[PDB]
Amino acid sequence: EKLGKLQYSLDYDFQNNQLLVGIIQAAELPALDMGGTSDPYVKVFLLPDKKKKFETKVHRKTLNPVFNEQFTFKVPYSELAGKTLVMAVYDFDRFSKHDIIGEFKVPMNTVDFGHVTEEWRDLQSAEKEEQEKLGDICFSLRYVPTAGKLTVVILEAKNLKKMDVGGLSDPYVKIHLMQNGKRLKKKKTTIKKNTLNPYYNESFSFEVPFEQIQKVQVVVTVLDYDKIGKNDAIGKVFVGYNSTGAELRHWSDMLANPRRPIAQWHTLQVEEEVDAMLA
Amino acid sequence: EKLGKLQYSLDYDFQNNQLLVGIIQAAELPALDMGGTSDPYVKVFLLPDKKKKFETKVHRKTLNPVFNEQFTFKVPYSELAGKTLVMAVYDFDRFSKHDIIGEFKVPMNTVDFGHVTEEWRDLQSAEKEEQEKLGDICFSLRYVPTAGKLTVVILEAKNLKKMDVGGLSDPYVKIHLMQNGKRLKKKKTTIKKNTLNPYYNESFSFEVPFEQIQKVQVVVTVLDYDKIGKNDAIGKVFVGYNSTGAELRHWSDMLANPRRPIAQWHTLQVEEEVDAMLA
Ligand SMILES: [Cl-]
Ligand SMILES: [Cl-]
Ligand SMILES: [Cl-]
Ligand SMILES: [Cl-]
Ligand SMILES: [Cl-]
Ligand SMILES: [Cl-]
Ligand SMILES: [Cl-]
Ligand SMILES: [Cl-]
Secondary structure: OOOOEEEEEEEEEOOOOEEEEEEEEEEOOOOOOOOOOOOEEEEEEEEOOOOOOEEOOOOOOOOOOEEEEEEEEOOOHHHOOOOEEEEEEEEOOOOOOOOEEEEEEEEHHHOOOOOOEEEEEEOEOOOOOOOOOOOEEEEEEEEEOOOOEEEEEEEEEEOOOOOOOOOOOOEEEEEEEEEOOEEEEEEEOOOOOOOOOOEEEEEEEEEOOOOOHHHEEEEEEEEEOOOOOOOOEEEEEEEEOOOOHHHHHHHHHHHHOOOOOEEEEEEOEOHHHHHHHHO | OOOOEEEEEEEEEOOOOEEEEEEEEEEOOOOOOOOOOOOEEEEEEEEOOOOOOEEOOOOOOOOOOEEEEEEEEOOOHHHOOOOEEEEEEEEOOOOOOOOEEEEEEEEHHHOOOOOOEEEEEEOEOOOOOOOOOOOEEEEEEEEEOOOOEEEEEEEEEEOOOOOOOOOOOOEEEEEEEEEOOEEEEEEEOOOOOOOOOOEEEEEEEEEOOOOOOOOEEEEEEEEEOOOOOOOOEEEEEEEEOOOOHHHHHHHHHHHHOOOOOEEEEEEOEOHHHHHHHHO
16 A cells, blocks of 8 residues: 655664654655645654654645654663654644554664664554544634734534543633743633533633734643542643644644634643643 | 735834844745746845845745744834845755745835734746855765764855955865854865866765764855965855755755765855854
C-alpha cells in the first residue's frame, strides 16, 4: 500500500540524557480524490506513554511537506528498552477525526545508538493511534483588529471522560486569557449535568489591543463539577503564542480572517503536559 | 496585469514608537518560473532606508502562501512622512535571479494610523527593487551527520562594490563559525586582486557534532584587501540559527540532503544590519 515516505533523524544525546527526534520531511503522500491535496503534520511520541505528544506545524495544500523540525524526549539511556518511537502523519481539517495518512514506528531495540540515524522509510497503514481518551472540545475564535476584541465561543464537547462513579460527568468549561505566564482574565461556562457530550454555545469576549494579540494565549479547560468535593479537570488545550500544530493553525486562521468566527475541534490533553508547554 | 493578491496589516504602536507590518498571505500568484508553481517569499522594507530588509520564510511549491509573519520598524511617529512601505513578493531560486513576482507600495501619507489597517491589495509589476548594491557571494554547504563535519566551499562572487579609487577591488572572503554569539572558528580565503568577480572555489571544514549543528551560525563576509590601511568589508550574509528567507532555505536544504553539497548565491547585505540580526 502506497502511503508515501518520511525522512527522520534519531540520536541519543548522552550529554543531556535525552532522545533527539528530527522530522525532516515527507514525500509522495497519497493524493486525495475528495480534496486534491492534504494539510499534513506529524505527531511524535514514545510508547507506552501516549500522554506526551508533539506536533509539527501544519503544512498547507501539499503532498511533499518539508518540516525541518526537532523534538526532545528526556529519557535515561537505561530506560530506553521497551519504548517505541511513533511518527504519525495526520491530515488536518477542523474536525475531531484523526485522519492518519500513514505512520512509522521505531522500536528502540532496532536502533543503533552511538551513531546518528537519518533516513527515509515508507509510511505504514494505521487507523487508530495510541491515544489517551479525554474527549474533544469545540470552540470558535474571532478577532477584530481595529476594535481589539477577541471573542471565544465555547460550542460543545464530546466523548468526555467519565468523572462520576456509576455515571457520566457534570462538565463545564473555563477560559484563561494569559500573557507571558500571567493570568489576565477568567471566564466560566454554565454547568451541564450527567453527560459526556455537553452543548454550550456560550460566547465570551476579551479586550486585547492589536499590539498584544500576538503575545497572548487562550487556555481552554474542561472540568467536572462536583458539589461535595474537588472539581477535577478532565483535560485542556491552548492556542496562541507558542501553540503548535492544530492549535497554532486555529489561531493563525483567526488572524488571517479578521471579523470572522473560525470554529474548530480540538483533542483534549492531560492537564499536566499542557501546563509544561505553557511553562 | 494579473499578478495575485497580498494580505497585510499595518499599525503604528505609539507605545513603543515602532511601525508594525504584518505579512499574512498572498493568493493567486501567477503560475510561473520553476514549473507548476513557485517558492514565494516576501521582502519587507521601509524606503528610503533601502539598506535594511526583512524576509519571510520561503514557502515551497505554492501560489497561495500563508505566512502569518510580523515585522517591526522603529521609527518616530514624527519621522514617518517621506517613508514608503515596500512589500515585494520574490520567487526563490539558487541562482542570482532576484526575480520579483509582484509588489505593493504603501506611502505613509496614504495611511490612516490610529486604526489598524488590514487588507488585500493586488500586486503590481516591478522588475528591479530598490537595492543597495554590494554584490553577490556564492558558496556551498555540506553536512555529514554521523561524522559531524560541516563543509563550506566559497565558490565565487560577482558585481562586488568598488573599494579601490580609480580601480576595482582586491576581494577576499572569511568565514566565522559561531554559536550563541560566541566565535568558535575562523577561516580566510586567498586574496584575488583587481576584480569585482573573483573566483575562489576554496573549501573549509569544521567539526560540529550532530547535537550542535542546530545551534551554530556560519557568517560569510567579503572584504577588500588593502596593504597600506584598513581592510573594509564590502558586505556579509549568514546562515543557520535565526537566519531567515533565502539564507534559512540554504541551511535547511543542507540539512535535508545529508552528504550532499548544496550551492547557492546570496545577496550581500551591509555589515551593520546583519550584525544586528546576529545580536
Ligand atoms: Cl505537492
Ligand atoms: Cl512544505
Ligand atoms: Cl532539519
Ligand atoms: Cl461538528
Ligand atoms: Cl525496545
Ligand atoms: Cl522502508
Ligand atoms: Cl503555505
Ligand atoms: Cl498572522
